[PDB]
From a paper:
Similar to other Cas9, AceCas9 contains the conserved RuvC domain that is connected by the arginine-rich bridge helix (BH) to the nucleic acid recognition domain (REC) and the PAM-interacting domain (PID). Unlike other Cas9, AceCas9 functions at an elevated temperature, interacts with its specific RNA partner, and recognizes the unique 5′-NNNCC-3′ PAM. We show that AceCas9 contacts the 5′-NNNCC-3′ PAM by forming a network of hydrogen bonds with both the cytosine and guanine bases.
A truncated but active guide RNA, sgRNA94, a target strand (TS) DNA comprised of the 20-nt complementary and a 10-nt PAM region, and a nontarget strand (NTS) DNA that base pairs with the PAM region of the TS allowed cocrystallization with AceCas9–ΔHNH. The structure of the ternary complex was solved by a combination of molecular replacement and single-wavelength anomalous diffraction methods and refined at 2.9 Å to crystallographic residual factors of 0.22/0.26 (R/Rfree) (“Methods”). In the final model, we were able to place 949 of the total 988 protein residues, 91 of the 94 sgRNA94 nucleotides including the first triphosphate nucleotide (G1), and all of the DNA nucleotides. Specifically, the carboxylate group of Glu1044 contacts the exocyclic amino of C4* on NTS and the guanidinium groups of Arg1088 and Arg1091 contact the exocyclic oxygen of G(-4) and G(-5) on TS, respectively. This PAM-interaction network explains the specificity of AceCas9 for the 5′-NNNCC-3′ PAM and its methylation state, although it does not explain why 5′-NNNAC-3′ is a weak PAM. Mutation of Glu1044 or Arg1091 significantly reduced the DNA cleavage activity while that of Arg1088 moderately reduced the activity. AceCas9 residues directly contact C4* of the nontarget strand and G(-5)-G(-4) of the target strand.
Residue numbers in the entry: 7 to 203, 210 to 410, 416 to 518, 682 to 778, 791 to 1134
Amino acid sequence: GTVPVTWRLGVDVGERSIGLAAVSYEEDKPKEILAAVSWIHDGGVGDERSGASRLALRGMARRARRLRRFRRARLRDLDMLLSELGWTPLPDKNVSPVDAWLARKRLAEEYVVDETERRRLLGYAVSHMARHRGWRNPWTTIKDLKNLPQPSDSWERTRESLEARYSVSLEPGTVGQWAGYLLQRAPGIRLNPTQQSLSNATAFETRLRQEDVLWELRCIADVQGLPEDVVSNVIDAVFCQKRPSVPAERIGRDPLDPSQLRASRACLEFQEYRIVAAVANLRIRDGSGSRPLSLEERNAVIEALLAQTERSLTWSDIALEILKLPNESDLTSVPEEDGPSSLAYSQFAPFDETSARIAEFIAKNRRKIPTFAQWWQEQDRTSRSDLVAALADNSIAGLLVHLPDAELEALEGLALPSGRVAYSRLTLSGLTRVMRDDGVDVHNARKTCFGVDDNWRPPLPALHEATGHPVVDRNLAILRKFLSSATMRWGPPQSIVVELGSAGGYAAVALRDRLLSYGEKNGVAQVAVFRGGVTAEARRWLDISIERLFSRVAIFAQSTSTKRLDRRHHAVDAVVLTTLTPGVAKTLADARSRRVSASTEEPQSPAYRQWKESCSGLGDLLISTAARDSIAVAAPLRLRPTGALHEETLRAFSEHTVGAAWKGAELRRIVEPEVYAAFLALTDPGGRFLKVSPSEDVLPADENRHIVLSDRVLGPRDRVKLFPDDRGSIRVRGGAAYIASFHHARVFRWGSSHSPSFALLRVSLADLAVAGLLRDGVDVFTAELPPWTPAWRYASIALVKAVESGDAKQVGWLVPGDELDFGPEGVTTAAGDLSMFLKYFPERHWVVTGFEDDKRINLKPAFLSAEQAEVLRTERSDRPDTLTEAGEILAQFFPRCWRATVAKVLCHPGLTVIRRTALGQPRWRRGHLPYSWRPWSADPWS
RNA sequence: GGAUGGCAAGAUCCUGGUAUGCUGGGGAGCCUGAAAAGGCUACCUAGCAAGACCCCUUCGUGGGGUCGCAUUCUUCACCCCCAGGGGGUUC
DNA sequence: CGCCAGGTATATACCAGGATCTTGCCATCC
DNA sequence: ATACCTGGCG
């Protein structure tokens, strides 16, 4: 079903956008622009204001959940430890706010005599300390915490500052002492500081260290006379912290054996592998040489490198002191099969760094590790290998033989080489055995152990596998969708050109490799990437002006080039990129910098004249193509019903008596859905929906009003909980929380065909949550939401009377980002500040951004860039008078653009909501992927 | 313009934690009130997405573990990849 | 009320140190 | 930035 055509692909990668183009060629001459679209993605940003990516915000929330859960676990274990001890935690209720501190300071000052009062005061103190234990390095241990200066340097300075500030010195004194004393002397004092950006005085500057809290705990242990047993146990209980780790899923796998994980660099197998590979590439002068090394010489230098305790032996030392060759020039190396030969004689040869680090650690700290020292003496290298890998894999998760503890806690103070290596451990071991037994290069050892071509590079990643970087993946997803659809509609491309704007250098390498795998699979002659501004010179030396290509008005009181203005330029950059070859971009990019840094008109060369004569046609191809409005700006749609279910701040409920008078606002606010349905029945007995207008009473103060429920019957003085605010809300964890942003909106309409009324139902994730519609197999856009859901509670009253009367039916659904093409007739309901905007920017393509209230929808122009308009707005307020009238208009408009009344939007015969293919062509057929439709005339659901 | 050894900085997440914050439950100090009932500034305590599942059972009517704000066309339908994950759908 | 148009609240900020990546620099050998 | 508030003007 694909018609083969000779074409070229062009990609222009931006920070928040990507320009894609498929262009057919004659010979090397462009005849027609098959497709040219500029997709506008978000860069993976989840909170636009923070800048945090969606992925990051998710991970933060995940780790917060697990922090809370582990804290629950250790606190319940602490309660279990100080039950059998005989102590008593702080009860949740009925205590004094200053009992914990009064405890923690008396226990550190005086010896409490009564054993019961001692035990409860201790229970108070340790319970509170575990609940407020301070900070420490997650990688260190409790026995490591015990070995730090106690008290802290920060705490000693804070304490000296407090002693001079409050004119009192406290022995010893602990942070509990100063806290309880300041909560006595100057009440209302805040302990740790905070910033919320006004006027207040705190008691502490820096975060308190767990070492200070442990210091206070041992002060109490000394003063109260506690045995070594229980004091050690309770410190291990209060400062119990899970040790950080990498999950085994995040380590790369070995390309030669994908069943195995990348080894640690500290690995003994790797140290041997590196030395054996370094020597296996050595050659010795025999004339008019050269020769491989004899088995004896190779073993000699391998053992000489393995045994050394420092990295001192150079290659000159190998060539003279070991191989006994006359001069250093008689030894060289060859790195590749059929490649050049060189060797720096001054450089050092590799050595086993981990065995040497263990050697110096044993020689320095031998008293502390007597059995390990003797162990690593006589054990052969196959056992040492497993031990070193166990040390590395427990030092990063991630045992093994006859381990005494006393030595083991010093063995964790050992610094081994960090980082991982390309190949697995068993792979290194096998490659060394073949290189040692057969005296052979690494490239032939590869073939001996595994069946592999000569030579072969480790496999390059494909398009359908991610980069982990959220900014690069938006580009990757759009690109692979476009390229798949282009290979299906037309032929596979002949050339692929990509341009980037180290932040995008990684993006360059990732995109390049994935397109290289694509090319060697589907057969593309040339695939090139370029940095960074090759297209700007290509254009403005071929006289392609983007404000002249698209007839757009001047913007400044100057004659500046407004190229970032129209978001279609990404596409046109793509289309011009398809005309390039590495040499032409070479000679153009040189000239750009040659000019911008240092009569006069430039350049010309045999490739440049050929390029220009072959590409002369584009000047008019672009005019014709932009005239027919063939260039499309698109925004991908977010349909997945995932994200924040509700706003995060819990809010306190209000209450309302059943017998009192009600208004519409107070009835929409009823929390219980059963109580809600009861009052909806009392407001209209045959009604399915709440048809009340807020700000206006609908029920009297019926003194004998009862509402019968299957739970219970309520009396006229009973109280029912109400949400705090007359806005879409839900109940989570005993509080009220506003719904989050709307997932989508459903477009209903009713009335005559020649003049119909429209309305929107603003559907949120809280709506789908309470309706239990997040199960499998649900269509979130057409699945009835009960009348109690916040969506129906806050629909337009016109809508809720029209839907219950059966006249209104769901006709479509809108989701943030999709496109509103008002066709050739354009916005006719223009009024106010919008119309003065349309006199200078005649925009017909609009993008949905939100659903502000129960009667409006938020639209931004699709072709104009928000960031450039912000540039203008910040510019006029700092440098005024430097704008045209259209510049002032564009500056004032864009922060919120069109905040349109839905009534004045959907009343456009034919207006099309456009849903594009990756190639930028509107789907018209009512297929399984989302498709275009017209609100004025579209078959209702079912 | 190649090869090799080393250094530094940056980027993206991942793991474990620290203070705040919010709601519920408390009460040291305090200001308005003849009250009566509510605000203040701190501190103590539980929880922090709604939820979906497993496991071990000594069967405790109680306990241990995972997933839950990413992968921008949900769900339904076709075409693909090396029996679970990842992709594409031309207007 | 229909239709605009201004104004404003949202959870937020640290830590050390792995895994996965990129640039830029230094030096010594062809 | 998004979804709330108030409020003018007819």
